[PDB]
Write a protein that holds these residues in place. Structure first.
Motif, PDB file in Angstrom:
ATOM      1  N   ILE A   1       4.216   1.895  -6.847  1.00  0.00           N
ATOM      2  CA  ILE A   1       2.959   1.090  -6.779  1.00  0.00           C
ATOM      3  C   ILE A   1       2.980   0.002  -7.853  1.00  0.00           C
ATOM      4  O   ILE A   1       3.495   0.198  -8.937  1.00  0.00           O
TER       5      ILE A   1
ATOM      6  N   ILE B   1      -4.168   0.621  -3.189  1.00  0.00           N
ATOM      7  CA  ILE B   1      -3.263   0.123  -4.261  1.00  0.00           C
ATOM      8  C   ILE B   1      -2.103  -0.670  -3.653  1.00  0.00           C
ATOM      9  O   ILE B   1      -1.615  -0.354  -2.588  1.00  0.00           O
TER      10      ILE B   1
ATOM     11  N   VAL C   1      -0.913   3.299 -10.277  1.00  0.00           N
ATOM     12  CA  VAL C   1       0.168   2.655  -9.492  1.00  0.00           C
ATOM     13  C   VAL C   1       1.329   3.617  -9.284  1.00  0.00           C
ATOM     14  O   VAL C   1       2.476   3.220  -9.282  1.00  0.00           O
TER      15      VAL C   1
ATOM     16  N   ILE D   1       1.628  -1.430  -3.393  1.00  0.00           N
ATOM     17  CA  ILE D   1       2.925  -0.836  -3.830  1.00  0.00           C
ATOM     18  C   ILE D   1       4.098  -1.517  -3.117  1.00  0.00           C
ATOM     19  O   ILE D   1       3.914  -2.280  -2.190  1.00  0.00           O
TER      20      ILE D   1
ATOM     21  N   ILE E   1      -3.115  -0.727  -8.691  1.00  0.00           N
ATOM     22  CA  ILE E   1      -4.077   0.250  -8.104  1.00  0.00           C
ATOM     23  C   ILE E   1      -5.498  -0.316  -8.167  1.00  0.00           C
ATOM     24  O   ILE E   1      -6.470   0.412  -8.107  1.00  0.00           O
TER      25      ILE E   1
ATOM     26  N   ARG F   1       0.852  -1.225   0.000  1.00  0.00           N
ATOM     27  CA  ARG F   1       0.000   0.000   0.000  1.00  0.00           C
ATOM     28  C   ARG F   1       0.875   1.257   0.000  1.00  0.00           C
ATOM     29  O   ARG F   1       1.848   1.347   0.721  1.00  0.00           O
ATOM     30  N   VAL F   2       0.539   2.230  -0.804  1.00  0.00           N
ATOM     31  CA  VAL F   2       1.357   3.478  -0.845  1.00  0.00           C
ATOM     32  C   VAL F   2       1.264   4.224   0.492  1.00  0.00           C
ATOM     33  O   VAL F   2       0.897   5.380   0.547  1.00  0.00           O
TER      34      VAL F   2
END
Length: 97
Positions: free
Chosen positions: A36, A92, A60, A94, A39, A22-23
């Protein structure tokens, strides 16, 4: 817990335990460098102003990085930074570059 613990775990390595962070979990006190890799969004209905990020022709967050801001979370790309929202920042998938 008086009894001892088990020991049937294999492959430990350091960090990196699954394809997806996750970002937001990659953002640390210092602006490291992540990216990412998915997404996707199976949410029955979750967009809001975020739709702008998807319409930014990126997705992403490609290869970039984030910078946790005490509750807030910003994103830094190779020559472009954006301000997403911790709400969707945890969707998303990542990882680190």
């Amino acid at each position: 817990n008086p009894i001892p613990g088990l020991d049937e775990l294999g492959v430990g390595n350091s960090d990196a335990a699954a394809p997806g962070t996750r970002v937001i979990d990659a953002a640390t006190s210092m602006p490291r460098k992540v990216r990412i890799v998915q997404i996707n969004e199976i949410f029955q209905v979750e967009t809001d102003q975020f739709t702008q990020l998807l319409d930014a022709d990126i997705r992403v967050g490609s290869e970039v990085e984030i910078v946790d801001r005490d509750g807030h979370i910003t994103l830094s790309h190779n020559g472009k930074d954006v301000e997403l929202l911790d709400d969707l920042a945890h969707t998303i998938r990542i990882e680190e570059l």
